[PDB]
Amino acid sequence: PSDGSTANLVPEVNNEVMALEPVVGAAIAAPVAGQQNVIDPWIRNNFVQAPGGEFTVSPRNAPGEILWSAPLGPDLNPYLSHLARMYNGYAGGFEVQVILAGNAFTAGKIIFAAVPPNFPTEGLSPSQVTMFPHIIVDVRQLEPVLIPLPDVRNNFYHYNQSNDPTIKLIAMLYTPLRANNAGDDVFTVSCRVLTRPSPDFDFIFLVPPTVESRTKPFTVPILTVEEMTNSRFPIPLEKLFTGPSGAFVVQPQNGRCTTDGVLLGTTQLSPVNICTFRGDVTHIAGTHDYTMNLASQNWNNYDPTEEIPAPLGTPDFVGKIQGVLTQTTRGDGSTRGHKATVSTGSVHFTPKLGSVQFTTDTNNDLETGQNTKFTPVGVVQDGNSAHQNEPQQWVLPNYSGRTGHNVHLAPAVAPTFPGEQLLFFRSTMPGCSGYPNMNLDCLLPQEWVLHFYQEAAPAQSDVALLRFVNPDTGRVLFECKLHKSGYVTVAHTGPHDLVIPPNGYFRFDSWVNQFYTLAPMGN
Amino acid sequence: MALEPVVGAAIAAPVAGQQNVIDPWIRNNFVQAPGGEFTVSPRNAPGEILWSAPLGPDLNPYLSHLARMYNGYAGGFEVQVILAGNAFTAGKIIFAAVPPNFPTEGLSPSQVTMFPHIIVDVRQLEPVLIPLPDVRNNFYHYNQSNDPTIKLIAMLYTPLRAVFTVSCRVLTRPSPDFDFIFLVPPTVESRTKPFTVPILTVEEMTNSRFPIPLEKLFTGPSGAFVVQPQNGRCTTDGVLLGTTQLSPVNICTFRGDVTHIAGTHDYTMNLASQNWNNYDPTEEIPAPLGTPDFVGKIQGVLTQTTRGDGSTRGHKATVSTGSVHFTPKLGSVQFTTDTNNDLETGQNTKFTPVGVVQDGNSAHQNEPQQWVLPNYSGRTGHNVHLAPAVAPTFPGEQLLFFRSTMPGCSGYPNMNLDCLLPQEWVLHFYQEAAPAQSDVALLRFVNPDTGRVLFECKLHKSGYVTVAHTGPHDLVIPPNGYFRFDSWVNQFYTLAPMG
Amino acid sequence: NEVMALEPVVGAAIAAPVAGQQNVIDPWIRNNFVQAPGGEFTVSPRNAPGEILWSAPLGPDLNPYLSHLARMYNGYAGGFEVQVILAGNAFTAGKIIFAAVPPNFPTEGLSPSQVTMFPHIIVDVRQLEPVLIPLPDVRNNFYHYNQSNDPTIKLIAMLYTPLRANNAGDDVFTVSCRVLTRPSPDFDFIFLVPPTVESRTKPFTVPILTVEEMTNSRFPIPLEKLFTGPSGAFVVQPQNGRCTTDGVLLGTTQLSPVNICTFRGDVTHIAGTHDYTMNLASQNWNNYDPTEEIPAPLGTPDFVGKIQGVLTQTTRGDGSTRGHKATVSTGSVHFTPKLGSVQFTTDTNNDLETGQNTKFTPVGVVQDGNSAHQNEPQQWVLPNYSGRTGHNVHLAPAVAPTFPGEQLLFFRSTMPGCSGYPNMNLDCLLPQEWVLHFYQEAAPAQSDVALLRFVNPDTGRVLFECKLHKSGYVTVAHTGPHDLVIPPNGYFRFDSWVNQFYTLAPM
Numbered sequence A: 001p002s003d004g005s006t007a008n009l010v011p012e013v014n015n016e017v018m019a020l021e022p023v024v025g026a027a028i029a030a031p032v033a034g035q036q037n038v039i040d041p042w043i044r045n046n047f048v049q050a051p052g053g054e055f056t057v058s059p060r061n062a063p064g065e066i067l068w069s070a071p072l073g074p075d076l077n078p079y080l081s082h083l084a085r086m087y088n089g090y091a092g093g094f095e096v097q098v099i100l101a102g103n104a105f106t107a108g109k110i111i112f113a114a115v116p117p118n119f120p121t122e123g124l125s126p127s128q129v130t131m132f133p134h135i136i137v138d139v140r141q142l143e144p145v146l147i148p149l150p151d152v153r154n155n156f157y158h159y160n161q162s163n164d165p166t167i168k169l170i171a172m173l174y175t176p177l178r179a180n181n182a183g184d185d186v187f188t189v190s191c192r193v194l195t196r197p198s199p200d201f202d203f204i205f206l207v208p209p210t211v212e213s214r215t216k217p218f219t220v221p222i223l224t225v226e227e228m229t230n231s232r233f234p235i236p237l238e239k240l241f242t243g244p245s246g247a248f249v250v251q252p253q254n255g256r257c258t259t260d261g262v263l264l265g266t267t268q269l270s271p272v273n274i275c276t277f278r279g280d281v282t283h284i285a286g287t288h289d290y291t292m293n294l295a296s297q298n299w300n301n302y303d304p305t306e307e308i309p310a311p312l313g314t315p316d317f318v319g320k321i322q323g324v325l326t327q328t329t330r331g332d333g334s335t336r337g338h339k340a341t342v343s344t345g346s347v348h349f350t351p352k353l354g355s356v357q358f359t360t361d362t363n364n365d366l367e368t369g370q371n372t373k374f375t376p377v378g379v380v381q382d383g384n385s386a387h388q389n390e391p392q393q394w395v396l397p398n399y400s401g402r403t404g405h406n407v408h409l410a411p412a413v414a415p416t417f418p419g420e421q422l423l424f425f426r427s428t429m430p431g432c433s434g435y436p437n438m439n440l441d442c443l444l445p446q447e448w449v450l451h452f453y454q455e456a457a458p459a460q461s462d463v464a465l466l467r468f469v470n471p472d473t474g475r476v477l478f479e480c481k482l483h484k485s486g487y488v489t490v491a492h493t494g495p496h497d498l499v500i501p502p503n504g505y506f507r508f509d510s511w512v513n514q515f516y517t518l519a520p521m522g523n
Numbered sequence B: 001m002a003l004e005p006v007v008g009a010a011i012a013a014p015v016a017g018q019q020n021v022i023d024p025w026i027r028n029n030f031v032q033a034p035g036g037e038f039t040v041s042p043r044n045a046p047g048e049i050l051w052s053a054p055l056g057p058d059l060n061p062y063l064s065h066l067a068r069m070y071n072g073y074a075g076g077f078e079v080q081v082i083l084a085g086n087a088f089t090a091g092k093i094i095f096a097a098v099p100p101n102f103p104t105e106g107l108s109p110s111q112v113t114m115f116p117h118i119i120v121d122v123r124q125l126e127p128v129l130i131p132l133p134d135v136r137n138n139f140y141h142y143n144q145s146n147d148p149t150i151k152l153i154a155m156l157y158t159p160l161r162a163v164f165t166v167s168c169r170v171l172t173r174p175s176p177d178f179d180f181i182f183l184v185p186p187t188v189e190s191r192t193k194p195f196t197v198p199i200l201t202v203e204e205m206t207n208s209r210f211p212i213p214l215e216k217l218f219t220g221p222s223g224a225f226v227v228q229p230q231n232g233r234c235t236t237d238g239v240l241l242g243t244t245q246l247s248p249v250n251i252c253t254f255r256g257d258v259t260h261i262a263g264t265h266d267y268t269m270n271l272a273s274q275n276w277n278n279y280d281p282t283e284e285i286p287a288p289l290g291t292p293d294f295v296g297k298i299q300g301v302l303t304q305t306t307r308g309d310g311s312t313r314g315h316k317a318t319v320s321t322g323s324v325h326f327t328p329k330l331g332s333v334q335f336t337t338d339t340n341n342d343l344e345t346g347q348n349t350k351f352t353p354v355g356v357v358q359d360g361n362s363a364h365q366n367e368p369q370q371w372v373l374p375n376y377s378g379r380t381g382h383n384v385h386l387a388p389a390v391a392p393t394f395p396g397e398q399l400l401f402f403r404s405t406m407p408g409c410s411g412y413p414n415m416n417l418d419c420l421l422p423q424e425w426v427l428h429f430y431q432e433a434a435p436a437q438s439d440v441a442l443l444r445f446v447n448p449d450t451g452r453v454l455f456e457c458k459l460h461k462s463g464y465v466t467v468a469h470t471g472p473h474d475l476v477i478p479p480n481g482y483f484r485f486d487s488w489v490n491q492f493y494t495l496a497p498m499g
Numbered sequence C: 001n002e003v004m005a006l007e008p009v010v011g012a013a014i015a016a017p018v019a020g021q022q023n024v025i026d027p028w029i030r031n032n033f034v035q036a037p038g039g040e041f042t043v044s045p046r047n048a049p050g051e052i053l054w055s056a057p058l059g060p061d062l063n064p065y066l067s068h069l070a071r072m073y074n075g076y077a078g079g080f081e082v083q084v085i086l087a088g089n090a091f092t093a094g095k096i097i098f099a100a101v102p103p104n105f106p107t108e109g110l111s112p113s114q115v116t117m118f119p120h121i122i123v124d125v126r127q128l129e130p131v132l133i134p135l136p137d138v139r140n141n142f143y144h145y146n147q148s149n150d151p152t153i154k155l156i157a158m159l160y161t162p163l164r165a166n167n168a169g170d171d172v173f174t175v176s177c178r179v180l181t182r183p184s185p186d187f188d189f190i191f192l193v194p195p196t197v198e199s200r201t202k203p204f205t206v207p208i209l210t211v212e213e214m215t216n217s218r219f220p221i222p223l224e225k226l227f228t229g230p231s232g233a234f235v236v237q238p239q240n241g242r243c244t245t246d247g248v249l250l251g252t253t254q255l256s257p258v259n260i261c262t263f264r265g266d267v268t269h270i271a272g273t274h275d276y277t278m279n280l281a282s283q284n285w286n287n288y289d290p291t292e293e294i295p296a297p298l299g300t301p302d303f304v305g306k307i308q309g310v311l312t313q314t315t316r317g318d319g320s321t322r323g324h325k326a327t328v329s330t331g332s333v334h335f336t337p338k339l340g341s342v343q344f345t346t347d348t349n350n351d352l353e354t355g356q357n358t359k360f361t362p363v364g365v366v367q368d369g370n371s372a373h374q375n376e377p378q379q380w381v382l383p384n385y386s387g388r389t390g391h392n393v394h395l396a397p398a399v400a401p402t403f404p405g406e407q408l409l410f411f412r413s414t415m416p417g418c419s420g421y422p423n424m425n426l427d428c429l430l431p432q433e434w435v436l437h438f439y440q441e442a443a444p445a446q447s448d449v450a451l452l453r454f455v456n457p458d459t460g461r462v463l464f465e466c467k468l469h470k471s472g473y474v475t476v477a478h479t480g481p482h483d484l485v486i487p488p489n490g491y492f493r494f495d496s497w498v499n500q501f502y503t504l505a506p507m
Ligand SMILES: [Cl-]
Pocket: A078, B185, B186, B187, C114
């Protein structure tokens, strides 16, 4: 029966069982629910992979790490997830199926535990997890693990739009992963979580779809790398790059946006205003320099009291940006345009205070009362100093110049998992003069900022697993982790420009946590 | 009583993959169809089909969302029609069920009575109920197929006597024999996502004909001009037209190798692709994607980088569209620069646009004519594979433009730049690829503070917007107002006056 | 566990009241599993979750017995039982999902999560016993017609968990899979009909001819060798020998293997030179119509170079005949065959009369010896068929491999040289006899790729396999330029239609 397959090398099934009493589903809610609803019985009789539903046990993982966790709710099941956008509430339990068919040469144990509502999960030790109803499963177990997840609660049913807690199911690494395959291979255990609603599960109230935030699902645009634009300078994207970031500090303030659509730093939605300035301009006596008193991006007065580091779209690197000042006179419509340059490392670059200084090609022909716009074009470098040294993309300017320090900054960004580096979306800035360092990396393409902003989809966990696919060949090129904080990471060591098919796109496959181990991409 | 009962999906059980159940409450409430708005106005005459819909999940917003989870369906509907008339209004509306594969084109009101029908007076208060059974000759219908179904049609049976527009609404609910058939994942390639319009504000969006933000909404008469832009031209279901591409930054830009013209400060650019590939002049496009779509002088900056040492050069430059040397369909355009030397020949060169200029000795505000197309192949022929021209077709209506102001670099230029669709709307339609359920998508502009509707407009499938107004007018809009897609309608819809 | 969540689906029994007749299939065919023609795929450690390793639609082409029978029947109805075999061992880990995708649902782009949402089975790489999958004929009509190509249910095989195994030495361990099929009891054919009349049932084939026995489709010369190479620098876009698998000719391609670089028409002298202008008439000697949706008259040369041959003329009344060494330059501005005129350089400025029909017989290519050696005949540069006065119109598409590790496979011949140092390499995408074969035997393509096997009949050994794309070009698994070392009697054999994800073994 098992001769030549598995070969008794492997635990077949688990004996342990969760010490939970039975718990009623939605039947209790019938006298006070608005309606008695029905779920397609095929959805109830068939396991499907949960959003989330992937996690890994690798040698990088350490005992105590929660490899997978989820609260009870419709988001446990993709069919129920889409249905839930059409209902106001729910009640009842789930059957979860976990697949752990590790290679026979692997060792290690996982604990699954049910933690009741309103108990804090945020510091649990392995000892402590044992005090809940729990099951301990060997990472090599062949038959899937079946865990019933009852809807422990103190009310008749749950509302989608509220934050009353539910039971949380936890999977934690109980014993580190060891292996004794003789060769130098990993044998990471790839695990799958599938679910189906219990018979007592039901939705409560029929309501207009998609208007409830907590049920909006997360997506990542189908756009190709060439079809998107840099979020730190109005340029198209060109390549994907990963490299080591230990030396310098990756802390941009443009193109910073969270997965559920909260903008951060100096980030705004318009991809054309990403290094623009608008306001009234003043000549500086005896020089070809002009001082600009800043208006907003929509030509309103600028309010420095706002909880932002600087006006939205203010450059987030130190360098000399060359462009054009343009001006129009209200009465007659006379227009003027002059070569201009802004140095963000200059002591007179104080956009938080409301003033920026340009160096122009005239000392007249710029009126003092007219609206003036700086259209950026490129970056420049002083040719007498070291080649490729002027534009430092990862050095933040002093938004208030010599007065005070920078405030309300978006956090810095770094890989936290062993073997991982940031993944940058790389664009090459036009050079106007000199020998400038023309590489510009952003953490998110501008179109992703647009998308996340509009679809304010709540993050089901802290990391969204993406796979990059070649649609011609159908093959996955690499996988990466998209963090809620709005940055991407990959499994690689060393600098590398990615070799990408022109048709490649990012495909969202599963929610994971920070302990997910990515397949190595490099070379 | 005029039709027999018609079985739904129960008959399909021996040949369907699965047996499914739909939430029975969905059939206990009449709900407005996604294309359940139509209008009767004195502009309409008998013979015009004022409203129509095919049987299918798209009749019901609940079934519409459910349909993303199923492969097919079978069964009928009960439809309810509501007419907002008054006692001073006269006329009759006939609703009729026309069976699959019968041609509606040319029907008289007399003939429409020969179908199962109801004749309802425009001044009735109480809603009228129509049964719509799933007459067919197969076991069931596939969502991904355009197989025909029974159609419900509404038209004026007697002429309307009454500015007074009669607002009408169509609501539906599934019959008890209706059911979905095969449970399937809601994928993107299904093209079952319903059509929407981005929530972005006019202020926060970008012009699709020049890399600048939008500023205001403008309506005006277009009898003088020929409205035929080639950028920002896109279909509601995501088909790009003309020279339109997706990058909001690469509009009115050029990339290629550059060559000096002896004795002048003028240069010739041999055009590479937007991706820096070779450019193929034989593509079925009027010109390379992002080519300027108006006649004028566009000033910017030419940029060049020498590979090997990192040498970079930048020079003020200017393109005159409609100049005889502007031939981007053939692969070359001519710039006038501020040097005759420093632009090297071997290296790749990029023109970054900034603004337009005007010769000050000529008539003021006459140089950039946004509604005059350049001759993409110069004198050596005329333009080909153009996106169609655009004009209002319904009496009382004008185009609605998304207006921004181009920066002026010198002179007295006409800085007015109107596009048909925001660039972000082009992006949205491309990615969502939502199939159009009719030829016109009715949009309403909403003030989110109060929930109030400020005006309505028609977004045509061809990718242009029209509104009910006469005369030029800059629209006065709350800065945070957004567009909302409300219903599929047809060409006979009468818009509320706006102004 | 191992059960696909599908309801039972009636086969041809439901069709009895509306079918004309009741038929019977040989019971041995019903009781014995047979390998689907493209029923092989492989699980390697390079594979990642979500990759579709194999797919097939339900239908008679999955079974060569049923495929042959369908040529004599009008329709069919019912399902199959599929047997899939996995060549694992106890020391492997990993999961494969098989899924039933309904008739009109697109497979293109599915994530692993979503594939789980179809009726499905999850199979462990260590499973020894074959997996039995019922594939029911989900449909919305009573039965299917052969000529109507109705869409059917699809079987999907996708990598669900990566393969975890040791390798032995440098040989990387892989799990080979095979897909076997046999008709369900409810499957049956419908109406007996004349056995080879119905078009959509003709099977695709490839000539048994040897490379030496075939002919180049771009110049009237025999083939000599098979050549594969990287093609990224240049643009592979020939206009002769371009034909689709189901027999539609493309570009300037025509059927006669001798008229591949010929010209016919009436000729006119250009005063003071040894040049002549030929007013072109159709290859069949008729009036020439430029309106034809073709790049140029059929058989017009599709490369830039100087072709030397012989002009021949015949006076109708007297019967006199004249023949003169001549040369055509396809890159010269006076080479405008789309407009109807071509310019020759001859060895006389006398003895070529007007109004008489004149035929250019091509012989070879020539090179200016004072220029760089091997620089004049650019085979992969198309001439400008309308000279300066416009662009080429209605071209056959350009051709490139899409799969990593794959390069074009060219049928290579060596052009005769007449003078100078010309590049005598000439590569075509299809032999002329393959064009002839596809055109006559107009077999419908069951997918975008026909898998071919190249066989040495002496030893019986297969030397390589290649992909014949429906568009009419071939690709192989190789990197770098290489002349193939082939036994002189080797032939191409058609094996199976496959899906676009089929990965072929390297040389
Ligand atoms: Cl989904």
